[PDB]
Amino acid sequence: QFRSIIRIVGLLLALFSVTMLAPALVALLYRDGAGVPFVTTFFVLLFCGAMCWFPNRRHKHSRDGFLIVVLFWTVLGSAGSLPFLIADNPNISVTDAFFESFSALTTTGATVIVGLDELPKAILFYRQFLQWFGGMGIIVLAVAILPVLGIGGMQLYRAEIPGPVKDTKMTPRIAETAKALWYIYLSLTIACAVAFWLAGMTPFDAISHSFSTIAIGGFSTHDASMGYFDSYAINLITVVFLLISACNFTLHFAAFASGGVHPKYYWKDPEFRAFIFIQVLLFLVCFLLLLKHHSYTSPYDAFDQALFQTVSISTTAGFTTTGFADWPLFLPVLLLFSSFIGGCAGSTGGGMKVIRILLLTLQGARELKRLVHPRAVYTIKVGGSALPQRVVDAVWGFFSAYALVFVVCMLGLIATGMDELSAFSAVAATLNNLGPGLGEVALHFGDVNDKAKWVLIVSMLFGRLEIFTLLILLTPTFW
């Protein structure tokens, strides 16, 4: 068992090193930057990645799959910290680095570096590049390797969910989902990237912010996310390229199968039909509360600021184009609760994907009807045919595990000296892969304690892996 596994591990470490070249290339095409740690890392990882799989080139073939994917992020996440440790320009500690490594790779977006505006333009590419890499990682995993495992959380995910709509063939897996999905990934990143150029900003900010919106990360090369240029176009592009990137990519497979027959594939999927209503009702109510409060002078800005914040926080994107200055205290909290309703399943997204919430709202009302008609027979409507009792169980055990981790991770941050409010603001921001602390203009992750940043890493994985993937690691039955 472990033998062929380390083959996979050292194999990926090599592939990660090949990624290190592209940043340093920028640190030579540009020379506002420091490239040596990337080339120092490229070598040391290639060795340490090669040293493990050479004596382990022996090939052999569920218990296998859970232990791979916790290594896919544990190993790659640790390796991601190395460039930051070496370079003296950030002057970043080890835990601050492991955090920024994981926060980047996990597509979280929670940063611990102050004043990154003037940081070198070489380390500034690597942060956004790691979000891109973890952006692709979730897609191949969520659509392909993960559903087989049994924690798919993609439409009617449970174990058997073999491509969903227009699922023809599908015999090759991961490998026929890593190749085909890349085209959507690349054709979506470039489209926004040149769109930002058409908005007007520099190539770097145009591109390295495309790696971030598409991967639903929330990073930036500026301390303020999209307040650097308070232009409706950039916001309206960042809004539309988060809504497009948040929905099921197996529904974005409605373009590579005999051309553009989109609307039938999209609208007949109940997850996308609920992604819109939840997204509209959010911004709709987050707008009426701004107009009644006169938080912004002209209702165009209020429209701009609101319609971006609800769709940058409830899609788990984590971009802040405001300071919630004129916003009621009661608005950042509501937006933070909306973070749990992350992007649609099968996409780069947050914790309880729309279906988990959709299934939860569906089932929770059925239990309200049966209270009056006990002898009636009720079913769930989501798809064409009602769900198997396995899936309904697989959502309600997921909510339980979620609010089991979220409480242990909270009484673990409290002990390290934080306060009740900041803990909630932190774990809800990291378990959901959000990033920004939220609340009444609060969390700055530099202030966080050393032994809390570890717990935060512990948590942001829990959200990125479907919580069970790592929760079963400490079970007696698995071992």
Partner 1 sequence: IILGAGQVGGTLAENLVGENNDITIVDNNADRLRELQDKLRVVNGHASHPDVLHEAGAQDADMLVAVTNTDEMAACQVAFTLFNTPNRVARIRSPEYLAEKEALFKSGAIPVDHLIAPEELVTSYIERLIQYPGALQVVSFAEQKVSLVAVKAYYGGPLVGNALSALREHMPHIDTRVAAIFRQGRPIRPQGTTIIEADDEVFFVAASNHIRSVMSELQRLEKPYRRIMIVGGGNIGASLAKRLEQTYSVKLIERDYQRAEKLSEQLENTIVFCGDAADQELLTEENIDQVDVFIALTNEDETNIMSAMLAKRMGAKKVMVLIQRGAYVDLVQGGVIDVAISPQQATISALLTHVRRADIVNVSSLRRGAAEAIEAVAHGDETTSKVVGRAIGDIKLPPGTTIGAVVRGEEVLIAHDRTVIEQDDHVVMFLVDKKYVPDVEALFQPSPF
Name the residues that contact a second copy, by CB under 8 A: 62-63, 66, 149-151, 159, 328-330, 333-334, 337, 360, 363-364, 366-374, 389, 392-394, 396-401, 403-404, 407, 411, 414-415, 419-421, 424, 439-440, 468, 471-472, 475, 477-478
Strand, helix or coil for residue 59? coil
* Per-residue 3-state assignment (H helix, E strand, C coil) for 394-444: HHHHHHHHHHHHHHHCHHHHCCCCCCHHHHHHHHHHHCCCCCCCCCCCCCC
Residue 376 contacts which entry, partner 1, a second copy, none (Cβ below 5-8 A, type-dependent): partner 1
Q: What sign does the CA torsion over 213, 214, 218, 223 have?
A: negative
**How many positions of this chain bind partner 1 (CB under 8 A)?**
15
CB of 384 to partner 1, least distance (A): 9
Q: Which one of residues 297, 368, 373, 479 is an interface residue with partner 1 (CB under 8 A)? A: 373
- Window of 119-127, 230-238, 342-350, 369-377 that interacts with partner 1 by CB under 8 A: 369-377
> Which of 238, 243, 326 is closest to 289 using CA atoms?
326
Specify the residue, 171 or 298, whose C-beta has the smaller distance to partner 1: 171
Specify the residue, 97 or 427, whose C-beta has the smaller distance to a second copy: 427
d(CA 220, CA 192): 15
Residue 328 contacts which entry, partner 1, a second copy, none (Cβ below 5-8 A, type-dependent): a second copy
For residue 383, report the phi and psi dihedrals to the nearest 5 degrees.
-90, -155
CB of 386 to partner 1, least distance (A): 5
Specify the residue, 294 or 390, whose C-beta has the smaller distance to partner 1: 390
Residue 439 contacts which entry, partner 1, a second copy, none (Cβ below 5-8 A, type-dependent): a second copy
Q: Quick one: tokens of 95?
A: 């835990």
For residue 443, report the phi and psi dihedrals to the nearest 5 degrees.
-60, 130
Residue 386 contacts which entry, a second copy, partner 1, none (Cβ below 5-8 A, type-dependent): partner 1
For residue 29, report the phi and psi dihedrals to the nearest 5 degrees.
-65, -50
CB of 453 to a second copy, least distance (A): 18
Q: How far is CA 29 from CA 35, 108, 121, in A?
A: 11, 29, 11
Specify the residue, 151 or 302, whose C-beta has the smaller distance to a second copy: 151
Q: How far is CA 72 from CA 88, 102, 106, 137, 471, in A?
A: 28, 12, 11, 9, 16
Specify the residue, 29 or 415, whose C-beta has the smaller distance to a second copy: 415
**Residues in the annotated binding site for K(+):** 107-108, 216-217, 316-317, 433-434
